[PDB]
Amino acid sequence: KLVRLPGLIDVHVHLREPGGTHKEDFASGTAAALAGGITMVCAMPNTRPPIIDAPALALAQKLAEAGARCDFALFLGASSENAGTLGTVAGSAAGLALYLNETFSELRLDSVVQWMEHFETWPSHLPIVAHAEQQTVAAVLMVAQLTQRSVHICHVARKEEILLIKAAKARGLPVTCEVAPHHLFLSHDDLERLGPGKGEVRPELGSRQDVEALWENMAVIDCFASDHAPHTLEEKCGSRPPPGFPGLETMLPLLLTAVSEGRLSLDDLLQRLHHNPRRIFHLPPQEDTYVEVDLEHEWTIPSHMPFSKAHWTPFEGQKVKGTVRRVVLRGEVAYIDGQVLVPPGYGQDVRKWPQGAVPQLPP
Ligand SMILES: [Zn+2]
């Protein structure tokens, strides 16, 4: 017998629209997400143009309302210039994202006092996520303490990063975090097959000592998220290859593979993949939704996946067992074998529903 899960939530996806549409658009990557069992996504702002002001937010909102097959929320991105400007639109976004590593020209921040400015100005009741690596995690965690608010750490990938987040929680601090599936299943010993051109993720894949620390500290991980960062194989193979892994399709397969192996339970999965995203980001229920998946179908991961324009994947040749069966969204039927049945534009900004409104008390 098969099993029906809730509509699952992926809170870190790069969707390339606008300004990278040959890599993926909303329609392409919302489709990749349903063929992987995700019904709500959170879009990062490092598009071109970057989503760093109300006009670019409104532009992304209109492009996404007409192209998203599942539901979605959009991230504002913190810049050197926009601290204190975003108060009008802060509630429409998934939250504010801080790019504290790998300096995009227009998402770069010059100093920690600039990080302070955002933690002050952004309304202390809406989410804040952080692209922080290594000691930067300690640094952003400090600005959170000073400004007496929560912070969400992105793409945790190192033994010291996760250990640092565990000590921050056991001391009671309001910090949450996420782990990407490449850092959970691949390592340095998978880098001879993937080479250097397509082995590009930030943060880089680490050691099996790193991967084992993530699995041993599963109770610190709040959420899984893909870091679905799709490029073409022509781009990753060349001179300046952008880091980032296409993974909205690959994700729920491997996480389901592990559950059969004991590695973690199933309420272990839905807590990281549905309940906590709803919790942390004040996201709402998607009434009359669910995902049927099989739990014995043994397969191998292909050379690429059906729907994502990426047209490759570094999980090529991993034997999994678990497959997306059906996906159905708000009274209608979205995914059934090899094809998707909801059209570009069926999805909606969850922040424009009222139960997606983030609770706030007037102080
Ligand atoms: Zn990312």
Curated annotation (Swiss-Prot):
Effect of residue 227 to N: Abolishes dihydroorotase activity
DHOase (dihydroorotase): annotated segments: 1-329
Top-level taxon: Eukaryota
Effect of residue 131 to N: No catalytic activity
Subcellular location as annotated: Cytoplasm; Nucleus
Positions bearing N6-carboxylysine: 97
Effect of residue 178 to T: Abolishes dihydroorotase activity
Mutagenesis or variant effect for residue 103 to A: Abolishes dihydroorotase activity
Residues at which Zn(2+) 3 binds: 97, 131, 155
List of residues binding Zn(2+) 1: 12, 14, 97, 227
Posttranslational mods: Activated by MAP kinase (Erk1/2) phosphorylation just prior to the S phase of the cell cycle, when the demand for pyrimidine nucleotides is greatest, and down-regulated as the cells emerge from S phase by protein kinase A (PKA) phosphorylation.
Residues that bind Zn(2+) 2: 12, 154, 178
Catalytic residues as annotated in Swiss-Prot or TrEMBL: 227 (for dhoase activity)
Role played: Multifunctional protein that encodes the first 3 enzymatic activities of the de novo pyrimidine pathway: carbamoylphosphate synthetase (CPSase; EC 6.3.5.5), aspartate transcarbamylase (ATCase; EC 2.1.3.2) and dihydroorotase (DHOase; EC 3.5.2.3). The CPSase-function is accomplished in 2 steps, by a glutamine-dependent amidotransferase activity (GATase) that binds and cleaves glutamine to produce ammonia, followed by an ammonium-dependent carbamoyl phosphate synthetase, which reacts with the ammonia, hydrogencarbonate and ATP to form carbamoyl phosphate.
Subunit relationships: Homohexamer. Interacts with CIPC.
Disease affiliated with this protein: Developmental and epileptic encephalopathy 50: A form of epileptic encephalopathy, a heterogeneous group of severe early-onset epilepsies characterized by refractory seizures, neurodevelopmental impairment, and poor prognosis. Development is normal prior to seizure onset, after which cognitive and motor delays become apparent. DEE50 is an autosomal recessive, progressive disease with onset in infancy and favorable response to treatment with oral uridine.
Family statement: In the N-terminal section; belongs to the CarA family. In the 2nd section; belongs to the CarB family.
This protein's name: Multifunctional protein CAD
Gene that specifies this protein: CAD
